[PDB]
């Protein structure tokens, strides 16, 4: 019942001013932390030669879009590698960031793993040494973090140990993080794996987000220094039922006021396998959403936001401007978006039943 | 309310005889997993240097100690490196461990790191790839492992989050291991820092086990396949009231009863800076205290086996039988001790009546 | 992480003597705290009208068998209306109850409600002004107390909620009942209805138990004075998959040894319908079980005591003696049984 400060008013000051920049108005997050697993794929997709000098070439490509992007991008999320990288220019990836308005992010989980006794649920490794790891990044030029559980909607998940396992290591993540510099992106996310419908995905989630919280209270977690990025609430991709982005968006944003404090800075959806115009939509709907939101309602997305510049660039040194191009749109698109500005035009422009 | 079986029965199978193996009547465990830093402030407490080399020969003056320590050590713990050592004969260390009757364990915690908005207070990492880890330990002969998280007493600890955490972790890590054909050695040190008195520490143990258990529960943990490694139950280093040996081992088995699933395979104490004599002296009540123990008793200790050795060793390869039978001796001690069969003499020395308190001890 | 006394040394020595003598070596207890509503069923089967009159009787009948059950009962749980009654020579039934060496226990739950948002699961109620009614249980006879809380294995049941509400108010009832010198019983009983097999039972017990105990912790409750009256490990009733009665024991007696500490006191097995046969035979061979029970492991039992004595009686005072037999004889059988000596006419991993 006795408070010992975990963070002095300098240090809370940092971090909230931090978290801010990453979500001001019309921005959000290029999710470019891809480990080199996962760009495997996205280089395969397109017959590249997972290279390490391709992969700089493709980070380097959407990091030097031209300023358009600038007050779209509040934040960038790097991999490990990417961040020690430089531009042609001999410029290190994130001095390109910062003169571009950007803030530095980095991965820092280790990745999920089997959780014993459970339907094939897992949670996530990562924090040994992580104080140190962070200590670094921070001096190397980055000023948020991001740490990925999964979860998923089964008969029998996400279980009670899955959902306080996961809601636990996310706190002790969130914890040293924040005695670092360090502004921790707190990602629970639900798959959208299964035939379940709204209404259960909607459930789950306010579920998960509630433990999450409960979980950052115990372990003394400054929640303005911190941002939140979850997963939409939407149906299961299997789901026969169908709905209105309207109603994805009062259930996702339903789900959060009955969870999120106001106190948390921002929200920094995931997209999670819908296409890129999908979810600029879904974010426009859930940013026009009739209700009360407390907190920025950005993005935060990975192939939502590099899955034609990828497909345009088809590994090609020619198709740089192309590439570059449709990574801009989408930049441009889901800026608008997250100020629930957007139309398919352009820059030209109950809650009782949840 | 569904059971996802974690282990098939033949797993549990492997985890039980493991767990009585180590703990069989009569046998203990030889905590010789000190870390280099750690280990390096003991041969500097004997004027020997810090090298690979007396390092080596200091844990096989341990491990290759006469056939007479055979029926008193059920298991020896070491640190990553001796686990790859070899003694002057060619043999690795865990070869000579088992050939002595002996289970191979090693220590697989990577420190504790302290936690942020707490009084000082830490929880314990190593969690990273343990997976991993332990199948290459496991190939290479390590049947059980130790994982070590440390609380304190003071006014505002340990606090409802340092138990909880600490519990989880150690739950985690209880669940990989078991995962890996390894028993886990669930280890909650309450240090013994501080001036508080015997039921103080009472109640703060019976809490953290109460704690500990909840979580190895909730995270599907086969308890017959593990042991506990406790702090007995005694007052605080700095505390004035003093108490009898049968007070401590009436608290300490008190405590456990009031926690302890019986099918906790054993508890396993750890010495805490307690004197060699002092720390089979409480064993040994422990042992004999007229209540019911539905788990074996006995030793695990690091500093309580080993004060005389050093000493008689000093760090010199003429002192080796002479060091050796030091060892010998409090381990014959203590066999009897965790069979309420042990009778001080005076032949343990002064140094088996010193104190080996160490404020929070780390290694 | 500081201690705050909840009992003195005295009130812990007299809770743990009252504790211990009721599960002594071959006793066990006989739950006849049936209510007016609950004990209606049993009377109809028997034509027998139910009023306060034929009540009396009918537990005076159980509470003055003869003197071969003193031995086999460690205590008697009466319903409220009971614990004021007296036998017709005006001897209070807590008198007549002593006088055989046994204890009084009370219920004093004040029933299950449901549990809103759950698929019809309940928790239970009865901690409003108890204290004051253990204070005046305990002036008028009374030693132990009983608070039933029911669970049921179902698709999602029981749920996380049921679990921990359960576990919790059961602390609270507990935490209560020591305050005023009674030894609570403690009864998570998860019921057997269903297709569930063994090991789905097993693991629920494993889980509400282990719940129970971390609730028990939280609210400081002594468990040396107290009791646990837990369903046994078995099938559900629509399992079609069948087990020895050596099975249900290795079952039932892994489940406790992986929850229960040793610090309990006793197990007083509920029958939870099962018959006088079966509940007899089921807890021999739990106690002839090849693995360390730290606890007496007996009985806490009702129509498995009362089933055969009812039907003798049925309603006719000139069938007090027939109907006492039978009760007498279950009585003999399942002393015979928490001992494993009773016949109905090495640690196994694959649990």
């Keep these: ?85 430089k531009a042609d220019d001999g410029r290190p990836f994130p001095q390109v960031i910062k003169s571009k308005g950007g803030v530095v992010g980095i991965k820092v989980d280790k990745g999920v793993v089997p959780l014993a006794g459970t339907n094939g649920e897992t949670t996530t490794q990562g924090l040994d040494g992580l104080s140190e790891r962070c200590a670094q990044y921070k001096k190397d030029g980055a000023d948020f973090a991001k740490w990925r559980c999964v979860l998923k909607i089964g008969e029998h998940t996400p279980s009670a140990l899955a959902i306080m396992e996961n809601a636990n290591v996310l706190a002790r993540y969130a914890s040293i993080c924040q005695q670092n510099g360090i502004v921790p992106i707190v990602e629970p996310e639900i798959l959208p794996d299964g ?8 459930y789950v989630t306010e579920k998960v987000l509630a433990a999450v919280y409960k979980a950052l209270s115990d372990h003394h977690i400054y929640l303005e220094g911190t941002l939140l990025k979850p ?47 999908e979810a600029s939509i879904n974010l426009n709907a859930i940013n026009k959403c009739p209700l009360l939101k407390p907190w920025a309602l950005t993005f935060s997305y990975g192939r939502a936001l590099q899955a034609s510049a990828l497909k345009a660039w088809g590994g090609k040194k020619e198709n740089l401007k192309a590439a570059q191009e449709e990574y801009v749109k989408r930049a441009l698109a889901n800026s608008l978006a997250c100020q629930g500005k957007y139309t398919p035009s352009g820059q030209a422009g109950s809650n009782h039943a949840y």
Excluded: W
């Design 195 to 202: 035939d379940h419908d709204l209404k259960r995905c909607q």
């Design 231 to 277: 997963n939409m609430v939407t149906p299961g991709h299997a789901c026969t039922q169908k709905y209105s982005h309207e109603e994805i968006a009062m259930a996702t944003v339903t789900a959060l006021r009955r969870t999120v404090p106001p106190a948390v800075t921002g929200v920094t959806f995931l997209s999670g396998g819908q296409s890129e115009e």
């Design 1 to 85: 019942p006795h408070s010992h400060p975990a963070l002095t008013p300098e240090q809370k000051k940092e971090l909230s001013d931090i978290a801010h920049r990453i979500v001001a108005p019309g921005k959000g997050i290029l999710a470019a932390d891809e480990s080199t697993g996962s760009i495997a794929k996205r280089l395969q997709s397109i017959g590249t030669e997972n290279t390490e000098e391709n992969r700089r070439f493709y980070r380097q490509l959407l990091l030097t879009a031209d300023d358009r992007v600038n007050p779209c991008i509040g934040g960038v999320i790097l991999f490990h590698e990417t961040l020690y990288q």
